[PDB]
Amino acid sequence: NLSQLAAHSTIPEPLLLFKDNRTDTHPLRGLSQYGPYSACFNLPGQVRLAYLAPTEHMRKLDAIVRELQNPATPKEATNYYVEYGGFEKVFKVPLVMPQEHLRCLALDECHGVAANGNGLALADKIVQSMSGLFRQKHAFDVLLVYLPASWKKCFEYDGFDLHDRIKAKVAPLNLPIQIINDTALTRQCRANVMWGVSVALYAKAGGIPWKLADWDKDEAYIGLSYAIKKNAEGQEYTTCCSQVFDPDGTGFEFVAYDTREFITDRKGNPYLSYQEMQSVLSKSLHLYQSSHNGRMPRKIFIHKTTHFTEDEIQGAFDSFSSSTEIELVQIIQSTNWYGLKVDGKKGDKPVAPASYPVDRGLYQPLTESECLLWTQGSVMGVNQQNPGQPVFKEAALTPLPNPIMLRRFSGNGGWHATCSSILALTKVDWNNNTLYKKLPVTLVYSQVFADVVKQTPEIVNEIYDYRFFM
Amino acid sequence: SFPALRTNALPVVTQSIRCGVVTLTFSELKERISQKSPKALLTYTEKVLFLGGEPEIRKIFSNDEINSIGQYYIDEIAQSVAASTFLKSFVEEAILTALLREKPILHRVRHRTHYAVIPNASAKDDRFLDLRKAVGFKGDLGYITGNVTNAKELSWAEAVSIRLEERGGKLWIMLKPEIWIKPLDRREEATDFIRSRRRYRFNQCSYQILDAWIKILFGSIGGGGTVNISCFPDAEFKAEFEIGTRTAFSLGVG
RNA sequence: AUAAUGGUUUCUUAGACGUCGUUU
DNA sequence: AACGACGTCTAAGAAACCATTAA
Ligand SMILES: [Mg+2]
């Protein structure tokens, strides 16, 4: 035929692993039925908790805590949400409330500072108020901070982010932090908010809510991303960083570095030279060697948004040994293609369009170096209602899914491995309560850490984990 | 197995074209085109290139300026389109003007992309009826153009965006339906109106809309045939194109 | 900032080209 | 032909705000 493209294929679905090694594609359903992965080792044996609220906002924290303890039912979405049985029932670990010595109140001058509109001053005051709790580091695990809407003036402006500023300021002091706004309290559907906050608190107390199954030990996955800062003298400071995800021995590692290791100083195109790429990949190699036992990664899956130059390709090829294969796939979001599902001959009617969009996890090879991957689509087996109707997560936003495009710069063979790895990495995010994300977790973590680093120029150079920015 | 994936790409079969080249910057040529507004297409390269009629060039350029006019044979159109961006735009305009000839379809440009808008005055046509069934709810028919509530002096119609792309030595034409809002400077005020319009355009509704737009743009589908179109068939420098009708599709490996 | 991504409008970067020059 | 310095075309992204809540 004049218009018959190459044959397409599907990679079925990532399978999450839960306590006692139970496989389940549904995150919330598996959490409610089985237990979290970390409960097998009882690593977070008790999720202690502390408060940080303005002069009169303690009641909201108490109310959200009580809602976390008590069960809830889904209201808005019903084909995906599962009934929330309360923290103790689902996660098998209490949420012992803070005592009188852990329910601190912020300084009354915080509102006075927010009246003028100084974001840095307010962040410094919040951190100074927090500083009194560093003595009792064994008395609580996760601190809860409530940001009232009356501070909305000092929330986001002229490239400033209070969230990233305080997440970077607190990071040297090893203490996970969770921010709750009026959005979580006001949102009509409470089951979703309860599920999200419960998963966030459990994961930031040191636990592992879930982890993917059928993961090869001797693999590495790296992703780079950049952020733009406009200077006074017409400059375009581009700050890049990298994030790797490690299966380790029995845990889960999600770390993120900074490229500015006394080098780079780009102030220009979001591209790095031979020296910068070699230095950046040296840290990734060292961390993979250290987390494992004297071994190198048998594969590398470095990804980013922009395209690799020839010097970048050479640096990537030379930063690793000759026994490892490096794929340098580039992910492109904006595309002019889209697809529609057509069903075959069933019964007696001819071919007709389906009532639901095309299957998620379907890829189409256009050329020998480009392909289309469907990170959005219809998922089967996630329907809490009648178990024959597929689920489309973004049906309330887009009537049809928008495919992503993969442009390979190295490697060979089919697209099975790259597409399967990307789709598997889309489901491992713990900050989101939905089924998946459009992009793999490496790109999203690199992007958020790039924003965090760009926010604070004087960020200390040791490597942080996911739980401190999630 | 028979699961099918249907794209929005139609193939282009022509491989080489003939055009006029005039032998004597881009900004001055664009300015001259804007002022003259002739019945021809022009572009700037190592030599100024055009498609149309000689009198149009005579109006554009003074008689003492045109040293010569010759015939340029752009063989391997896909490679040349991929190599240069000006040739991409020139082929865009040529194939589009060949496409929208002798049809009651408007033409508008926003953000350097081309649309095919349905006219208000010519809404109730026989060809414009199959699109009204797909837009319509259940067995009812849908309004293909009209006004937007709580929006004084602001209209809307059904449009399709037409693009061209090169992938692996082949040329494809991209079709994608939106709603066109007139005037252009106040498109944002109808954003919600667009969303509520496309909230329930699922797989089958979008499939039918695409099929209707293909029928409107070409006039015949099926049989594994192709449509021949012509741009400026009234001069020595003419464009002849051959476009397939069946959209690019794929089947499972089994 | 429990969260998902759909729009809108700017800006930047990178390629491709051209034009005096300019250096020599 | 010496290396800038300045204009077009395209393809891609990032801030910075709006919106509703899965046939
Ligand atoms: Mg968080």
Numbering used by the authors:
A (entry chain C): 4 to 473
B (entry chain B): 327 to 350, 355 to 584
Task: Give the original sentences from the paper that presented this experimental model.
Short prokaryotic Argonaute proteins (Agos) are associated with NADase domain-containing proteins (TIR-APAZ or SIR2-APAZ) encoded in the same operon. They confer immunity against mobile genetic elements, such as bacteriophages and plasmids, by inducing NAD+ depletion upon recognition of target nucleic acids. Target DNA binding triggers tetramerization of the TIR-APAZ/Ago complex by a cooperative self-assembly mechanism, while the heterodimeric SIR2-APAZ/Ago complex does not assemble into higher-order oligomers upon target DNA binding. However, the NADase activities of these two systems are unleashed via a similar closed-to-open transition of the catalytic pocket, albeit by different mechanisms.
To explore the molecular basis of SIR2-APAZ/Ago system, we determined the cryo-EM structure of the target ssDNA-bound quaternary complex from Geobacter sulfurreducens at a resolution of 3.0 Å. The Ago protein and the APAZ domain of SIR2-APAZ, as well as a ~25-bp gRNA–DNA hybrid, could be clearly assigned in the present EM map. However, the SIR2 domain is missing. The resolved complex adopts a canonical bilobed Ago architecture, with the gRNA–DNA duplex inserted through the central channel formed by Ago protein and the APAZ domain of SIR2-APAZ. The flipped 1A of gRNA is sandwiched between Phe158 and His166, with the 5′-phosphate group recognized in a conserved metal-dependent fashion, similar to that in TIR-APAZ/Ago system. Surprisingly, Arg190 protruding from MID domain orientates the base group of 2U, thus blocking the potential base pairing between 2U and 2’dA. As a result, the 2’dA of target ssDNA flips out and projects into a pocket formed by Ago protein and the APAZ domain. Destabilization of the SIR2 domain is suggested to be required for the NADase activity of ThsA, which is in line with our observation that the SIR2 domain is dissociated from Ago protein and is not visible in the active SIR2-APAZ/Ago–gRNA–DNA complex. Interestingly, a long loop (aa 261–276, termed sensor loop) in PIWI domain shifts away from the gRNA–DNA duplex compared to that in the AF structure. Although the target ssDNA binding is expected to trigger the conformational change of PIWI domain in SIR2-APAZ/Ago system, the corresponding dimerization interface is occupied by SIR2 domain, partially explaining why the SIR2-APAZ/Ago complex does not form higher-order oligomers.
